[PDB]
């Protein structure tokens, strides 16, 4: 009966930053994946366990849209199999994911003439995070036998670094929004399928 919220996922102007990545969940609705593939503006549609053109005729238990913003030259990290600050510390997909990653240049939407310090990524952690783990804790990361007492200094780091998305950035330094559509099948008591 109902039509899926993809129309808002790709039109909410306010997105969280990757360390605090948003999740929205799809249920009881018509999932028009194909009109996403008709989009003028998109800059990746690389998918895992699928080819995007055919998707419309398939049926699913749940879908998660996970969404955030990334510096373009590190958009490659988001998919499986590669270490890098995002995949190491902010947002890791499984050993065998199934779903699709959608991304687009956002400099016209997201940049500010000062750098937009509302955008943040974690760059220190005691160990790498597990698949779809999330961590908005911000207690000081130590770098020496110094107990940092929960306050910053030499060898005592605040965990989150900003991207600084200026208008004067090259193609790869620019902000790219990302949505990861994570799929699920199972025994399949589905409430999500395309038209």
């Amino acid at each position: 009966t109902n039509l899926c919220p993809f129309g808002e996922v790709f039109n909410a102007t306010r997105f969280a930053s990757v360390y605090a990545w948003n999740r929205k969940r799809i249920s009881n609705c018509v999932a028009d994946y194909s009109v996403l593939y008709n989009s003028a503006s998109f800059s990746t549609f690389k998918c895992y366990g699928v080819s995007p053109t055919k998707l419309n005729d398939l049926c699913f238990t749940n879908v998660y849209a996970d969404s955030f913003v990334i510096r373009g030259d590190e958009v490659r990290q988001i998919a499986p199999g590669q270490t890098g600050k995002i995949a190491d510390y902010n947002y890791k997909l499984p050993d065998d994911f199934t779903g699709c990653v959608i991304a687009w240049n956002s400099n016209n939407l997201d940049s500010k003439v000062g750098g937009n310090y509302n955008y943040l990524y974690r760059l220190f952690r005691k160990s790498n995070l597990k698949p779809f783990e999330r961590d908005i804790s911000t207690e000081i990361y130590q770098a020496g036998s110094t107990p940092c007492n929960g306050v910053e200094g030499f060898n005592c780091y605040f965990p989150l670094q900003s991207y600084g998305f200026q208008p004067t950035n090259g193609v790869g330094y620019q902000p790219y929004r990302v949505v990861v559509l994570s799929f699920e099948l199972l025994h399949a008591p589905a409430t999500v399928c395309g038209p």
Epitope: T138, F154, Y157, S162
Partner: antibody
């Protein structure tokens, strides 16, 4: 760019608490720290405590821990210091100042300062 | 925790003069130190955010130096803009204690 503007002067009886505030303009607390500094009249500057409005986390120097609390409401771009139990020796000019706790692994480089609030007793 | 000291208390100078100031730290700092000035009865402003790295919009009148402790700040072609009191401040371990300050008379 971002300009802090700061509460007018506070005259209060000894021991009775005080409240003072800073609010941003041309922006907001975009994951900056803001932190509070005394200029006691003709003394060196002294540092009171960090707050990061983006996370509400705050911490204090040993000398003020317990005497003071600092707080903020990011949606209204406003941070507050309130101090109890005042004037042991104290009638300082109080400054808020920002520092960019997410911009680098370098800290306490206070690049913008409020106008300063006189806080004092009779 | 850390302690600061800064010398001298005051200096006389002239417009166009060259002048140098020092700060010293009681634990070593690996060049985690800053410098500020304030005019009499107005807000401090930051000049330097390491031993040497100058802050944006500040004129070329200033330079700084040091190595683990015993830092310095220098004025070249001194101005009425430099009548201010100057402070050092360590950033190496909290709380970020400021110096006692120094006075320049034009």
């Amino acid at each position: 760019q971002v300009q802090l503007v700061q509460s007018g002067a506070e005259v209060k009886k000894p021991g009775s608490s005080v409240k003072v505030s800073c609010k941003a303009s041309g922006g907001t607390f975009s994951s900056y720290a803001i932190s509070w500094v005394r200029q006691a009249p003709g003394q060196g500057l002294e540092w009171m405590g960090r707050i990061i409005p983006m996370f509400g986390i705050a911490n204090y120097a040993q000398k003020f821990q317990g005497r003071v609390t600092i707080t903020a409401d990011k949606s209204t771009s406003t941070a507050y210091l309130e101090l109890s139990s005042l004037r042991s020796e104290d009638t300082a000019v109080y400054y808020c100042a920002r520092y960019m706790v997410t911009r680098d692994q370098y800290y306490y480089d206070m690049d913008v300062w409020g106008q300063g609030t006189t806080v004092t007793v009779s | 925790d850390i302690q600061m000291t800064q010398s001298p208390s005051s200096l006389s100078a002239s417009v166009g003069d060259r002048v140098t100031i020092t700060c010293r730290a009681s634990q070593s700092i690996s060049n985690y130190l800053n410098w500020y000035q304030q005019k009499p009865g107005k807000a401090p402003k930051l000049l330097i955010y390491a031993a040497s790295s100058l802050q944006s919009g500040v004129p070329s009148r200033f330079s700084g130096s040091g190595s683990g402790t015993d830092f310095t700040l220098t004025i070249s072609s001194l101005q009425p803009e430099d009548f201010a009191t100057y402070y050092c401040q360590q950033s190496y371990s909290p709380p970020p204690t400021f110096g006692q300050g120094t006075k320049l008379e034009i």
